[PDB]
Amino acid sequence: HILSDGKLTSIQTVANFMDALVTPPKPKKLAEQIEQSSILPELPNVKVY
Amino acid sequence: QPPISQQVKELLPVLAAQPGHYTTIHIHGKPYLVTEGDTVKLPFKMPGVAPGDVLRLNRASVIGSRDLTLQGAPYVDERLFECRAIVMGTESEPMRVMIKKKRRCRKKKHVFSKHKYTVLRINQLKINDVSSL
Amino acid sequence: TVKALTQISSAGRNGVGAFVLQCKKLDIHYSDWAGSSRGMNGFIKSLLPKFAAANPQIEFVVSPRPAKHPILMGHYINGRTKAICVRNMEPLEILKKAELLRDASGEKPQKFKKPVTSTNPSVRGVWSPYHGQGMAV
Amino acid sequence: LGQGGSRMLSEETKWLAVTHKSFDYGRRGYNTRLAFLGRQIIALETTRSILTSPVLNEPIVDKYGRTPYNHAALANIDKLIYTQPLDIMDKTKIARMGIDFGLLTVMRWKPRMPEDLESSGVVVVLNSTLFAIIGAISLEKGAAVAQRIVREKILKRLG
Amino acid sequence: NDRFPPLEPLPPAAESLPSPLPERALTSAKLAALHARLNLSPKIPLQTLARTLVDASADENPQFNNANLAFVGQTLINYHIAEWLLCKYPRLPQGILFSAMKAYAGPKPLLQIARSWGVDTAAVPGGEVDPGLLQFDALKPGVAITNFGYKRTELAYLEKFKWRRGMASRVVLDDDFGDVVRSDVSYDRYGNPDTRAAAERAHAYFVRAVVGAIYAHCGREAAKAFVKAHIMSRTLDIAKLFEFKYPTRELAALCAREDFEPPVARLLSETGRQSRTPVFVVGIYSGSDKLGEGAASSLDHARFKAAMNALKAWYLYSPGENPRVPSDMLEEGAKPWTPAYIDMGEVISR
Amino acid sequence: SFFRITLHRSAIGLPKRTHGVLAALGLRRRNQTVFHPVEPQFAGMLMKVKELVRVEEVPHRLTKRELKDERKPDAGFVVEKQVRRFIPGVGVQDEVDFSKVGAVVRDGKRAGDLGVRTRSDWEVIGKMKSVLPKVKAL
Numbered sequence: 001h002i003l004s005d006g007k008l009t010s011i012q013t014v015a016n017f018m019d020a021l022v023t024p025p026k027p028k029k030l031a032e033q034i035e036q037s038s039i040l041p042e043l044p045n046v047k048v049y
Numbered sequence: 050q051p052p053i054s055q056q057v058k059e060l061l062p063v064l065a066a067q068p069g070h071y072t073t074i075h076i077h078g079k080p081y082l083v084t085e086g087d088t089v090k091l092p093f094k095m096p097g098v099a100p101g102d103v104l105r106l107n108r109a110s111v112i113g114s115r116d117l118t119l120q121g122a123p124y125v126d127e128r129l130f131e132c133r134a135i136v137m138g139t140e141s142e143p144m145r146v147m148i149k150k151k152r153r154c155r156k157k158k159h160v161f162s163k164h165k166y167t168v169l170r171i172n173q174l175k176i177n178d179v180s181s182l
Numbered sequence: 183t184v185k186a187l188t189q190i191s192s193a194g195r196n197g198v199g200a201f202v203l204q205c206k207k208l209d210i211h212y213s214d215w216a217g218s219s220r221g222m223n224g225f226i227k228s229l230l231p232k233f234a235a236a237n238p239q240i241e242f243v244v245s246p247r248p249a250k251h252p253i254l255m256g257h258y259i260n261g262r263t264k265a266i267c268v269r270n271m272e273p274l275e276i277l278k279k280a281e282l283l284r285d286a287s288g289e290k291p292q293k294f295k296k297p298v299t300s301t302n303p304s305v306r307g308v309w310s311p312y313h314g315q316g317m318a319v
Numbered sequence: 320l321g322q323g324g325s326r327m328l329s330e331e332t333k334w335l336a337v338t339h340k341s342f343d344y345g346r347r348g349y350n351t352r353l354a355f356l357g358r359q360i361i362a363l364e365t366t367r368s369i370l371t372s373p374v375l376n377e378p379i380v381d382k383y384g385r386t387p388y389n390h391a392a393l394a395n396i397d398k399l400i401y402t403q404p405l406d407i408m409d410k411t412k413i414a415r416m417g418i419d420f421g422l423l424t425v426m427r428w429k430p431r432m433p434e435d436l437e438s439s440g441v442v443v444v445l446n447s448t449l450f451a452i453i454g455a456i457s458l459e460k461g462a463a464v465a466q467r468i469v470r471e472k473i474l475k476r477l478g
Numbered sequence: 479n480d481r482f483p484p485l486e487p488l489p490p491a492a493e494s495l496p497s498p499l500p501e502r503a504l505t506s507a508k509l510a511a512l513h514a515r516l517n518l519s520p521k522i523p524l525q526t527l528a529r530t531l532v533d534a535s536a537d538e539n540p541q542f543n544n545a546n547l548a549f550v551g552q553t554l555i556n557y558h559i560a561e562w563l564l565c566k567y568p569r570l571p572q573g574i575l576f577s578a579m580k581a582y583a584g585p586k587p588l589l590q591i592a593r594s595w596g597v598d599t600a601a602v603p604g605g606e607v608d609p610g611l612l613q614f615d616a617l618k619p620g621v622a623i624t625n626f627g628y629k630r631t632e633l634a635y636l637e638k639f640k641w642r643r644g645m646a647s648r649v650v651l652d653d654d655f656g657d658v659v660r661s662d663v664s665y666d667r668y669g670n671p672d673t674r675a676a677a678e679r680a681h682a683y684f685v686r687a688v689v690g691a692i693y694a695h696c697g698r699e700a701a702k703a704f705v706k707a708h709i710m711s712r713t714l715d716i717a718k719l720f721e722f723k724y725p726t727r728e729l730a731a732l733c734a735r736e737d738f739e740p741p742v743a744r745l746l747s748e749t750g751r752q753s754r755t756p757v758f759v760v761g762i763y764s765g766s767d768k769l770g771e772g773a774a775s776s777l778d779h780a781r782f783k784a785a786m787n788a789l790k791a792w793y794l795y796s797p798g799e800n801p802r803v804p805s806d807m808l809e810e811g812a813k814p815w816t817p818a819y820i821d822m823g824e825v826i827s828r
Numbered sequence: 829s830f831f832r833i834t835l836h837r838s839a840i841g842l843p844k845r846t847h848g849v850l851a852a853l854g855l856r857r858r859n860q861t862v863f864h865p866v867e868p869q870f871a872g873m874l875m876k877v878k879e880l881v882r883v884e885e886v887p888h889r890l891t892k893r894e895l896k897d898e899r900k901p902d903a904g905f906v907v908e909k910q911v912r913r914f915i916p917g918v919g920v921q922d923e924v925d926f927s928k929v930g931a932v933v934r935d936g937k938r939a940g941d942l943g944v945r946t947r948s949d950w951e952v953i954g955k956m957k958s959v960l961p962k963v964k965a966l
């Protein structure tokens with residue numbers, strides 16, 4: 001993982017360092033974002049394509 | 050509560066025994082002559098109601114059958130009858146444009162009006178037995 | 183001799199005995215690229231999950247539709263369809279529009295003419311000049 | 320109807336149930352309407368005697384190798400695959416019951432050809448009379464009293 | 479292809495099955511909405527509601543099909559309406575009774591109850607279709623349910639040679655609506671009057687099945703409430719099922735049977751005689767009592783119409799709008815049963 | 829006491845000074861009710877518009893929320909049963925029947941917290957293959 005200087009400067013605590021490394025990029029597609037949601041995938045009457 | 054008149058207590062069974070009954074309910078002061086099963090389309094959007102909601106109507110000006118008519122002075126006593134409705138959703142009208150204009154003046158002002166209306170369904174209209182009362 | 187006719191059936195009155203929400207389906211079309219779908223994307227993540235749980239009798243289908251404005255298309259029991267373009271609307275405006283499709287019926291809009299609609303004959307029958315006290319000119 | 324049968328119905332009703340539409344050109348009431356309700360009552364009791372009867376059913380092997388849902392509530396409704404109500408409610412079986420209890424010497428009908436009773440509608444005429452007796456008990460005494468008589472005085476005599 | 483992956487994950491051996499698998503019903507949004515639309519209790523799983531939507535024309539197997547549920551349901555619907563109709567109008571003529579049973583629990587009204595529930599049909603039955611669609615095969619001619627009525631020995635003659643059937647044997651020999659019993663593929667075609675019947679049949683069997691599932695899972699009392707709410711709530715004008723042949727003669731036989739004095743037609747009012755559209759009001763009077771009244775343009779027609787109104791009043795006599803039903807006794811302890819009125823029968827006259 | 833003044837007529841064609849008298853009393857539109865203390869200053873104010881208003885002595889002054897509550901018609905209905913709804917700022921309010929009375933609003937970040945039937949609940953109901961209604965009830 002190559003960390004940017006904008007990140008290293010923003011990092012100030014050990015917890016911030018862990019977040020930058022273990023947090024994968026946020027999904028751009030709303031569909032992949034809905035799969036991670038807890039409510040919508042579980043509802044019986046809702047179907048996401 | 051005020052006891053019902055003895056004349057209304059002896060003729061109410063004669064009114065409830067006849068085949069059909071109608072009533073004049075009052076929603077916000079406006080009357081609507083209806084019968085069980087009728088569909089009232091109110092000229093306003095009742096706030097805070099969703100389809101499936103049950104409304105109990107308690108302001109009835111007239112309850113009568115073919116030959117007999119029960120009239121309350123301001124309104125009939127709620128203990129005598131039981132009227133209930135159900136909200137069947139809301140409907141709208143086609144947008145209508147009003148053009149306000151004066152002669153020899155090019156400016157035509159437009160007014161767009163598209164109102165919503167709540168629709169009801171009288172699913173219960175029964176006259177109670179007041180022998181106990 | 184009485185001969186029974188066999189060409190008349192019973193008519194249903196929704197709301198009497200049982201109620202059936204006229205809205206049976208709701209199509210939610212969004213776009214990840216279109217800028218006009220920014221609010222629709224925020225409605226699907228914050229307000230749709232709970233609104234879809236409050237109406238378990240509606241089939242919600244969320245499908246993408248790039249290169250097109252976002253729309254709410256509600257299918258009704260009578261076979262008709264109502265679509266609403268929600269371009270450039272905020273998430274709370276979409277929830278106000280989805281409540282319009284849920285409370286609405288499949289019928290076409292019509293001007294307000296008469297409040298009551300009854301299919302049951304008059305309790306007091308229609309007037310007749312022959313069933314009263316008469317009239318003298 | 321067993322002990323107390325005569326008193327359960329009524330003087331007028333008991334005669335009406337046993338009277339067919341072919342007697343006296345219907346000037347005196349007939350049991351046709353009662354026979355309608357009686358059949359509806361009997362059908363719903365023979366359908367319940369197949370659903371609630373404890374029997375070991377052989378499951379069918381689907382050609383496509385599918386597996387059924389196998390719910391305990393649908394196992395009772397899957398009992399109609401082997402025993403159908405009409406197998407129990409046979410015209411000849413129900414008609415034979417009345418002839419055994421002496422219903423042929425009591426009922427009021429006019430056969431078109433008296434000598435050849437069989438070809439004059441004895442089966443159809445006997446079934447309409449046995450349904451009426453059950454259609455009149457229900458209306459006059461309630462379903463609970465009728466449901467006890469269909470399970471004991473009809474179904475228990477037809478296996 | 480790679481650009482268009484399948485929307486629904488399914489095995490390769492899924493487009494060949496007659497109907498979707500039971501576990502497929504646990505991932506469809508149409509069933510979950512259909513189950514919540516009818517307010518069915520949670521006792522009925524989704525794997526059971528799916529079976530109600532699979533007609534016996536799409537699946538020959540006794541299980542996975544509507545054959546058994548639709549039977550148990552037809553018996554309940556028919557029984558509950560039969561007892562309610564006899565308690566409400568105890569004097570209905572038998573032919574009219576058959577027409578009124580068919581007007582509530584027949585293929586025609588049951589087709590509208592299914593269309594009021596938002597039930598969309600599948601084009602062609604297959605394992606790929608989602609279980610939330612009513613799936614049947616309308617090109618299969620021989621699909622039918624099992625009925626209690628028997629086949630008539632003279633069935634062929636009745637149709638071909640116009641033999642007489644009768645209305646007293648229909649109760650035993652015929653079905654519950656009086657009708658007689660036993661009365662590759664190319665999709666380049668149009669609808670048929672025979673297919674429309676299969677479409678009506680499939681919808682009716684489904685609505686009957688839903689009642690069969692409610693009875694199996696929720697019990698008897700639940701089924702009666704469902705029938706009372708969705709079927710018996712429909713409105714019908716029974717006065718419009720009447721067709722009279724020589725009503726004046728029939729009315730005379732009525733008064734003679736009940737010992738009422740002979741009926742006499744009297745001209746209550748009239749106007750416009752010797753005009754294009756006169757009005758005559760004649761009232762049929764048995765002694766001093768007035769049985770019925772009718773108004774027509776012709777003097778004879780007014781006398782006929784007045785006789786019909788008197789006969790309709792005799793047959794359409796109702797003790798009450800919401801009468802007690804004999805089925806109310808077998809449930810939890812209720813008030814003792816009171817004998818209901820039993821009419822002799824409709825008058826037979828010349 | 830107080831003066832209960834109600835503008836019965838208009839002043840569309842009256843002099844401009846008459847509009848200054850109706851502006852000091854507070855009568856903007858027609859049939860508008862105002863309450864002013866009984867005093868010579870107001871009494872001479874009404875002698876200038878006495879052809880347009882209706883005066884009445886009242887014991888106490890009426891508030892803004894009480895002048896409107898005397899022309900308010902009775903609703904004529906009462907909500908006795910409500911169906912499940914989603915309130916944007918509160919949560920998912922369950923069904924309530926006021927005939928047996930319970931507005932319980934469950935909010936959360938999971939479907940289970942909302943109080944609705946989820947897919948897992950439909951799998952638990954589908955595996956209960958032993959549940960059966962009593963023979964007497966069947």
Ligand SMILES: [Mg+2]
């Ligand atoms: Mg001016």
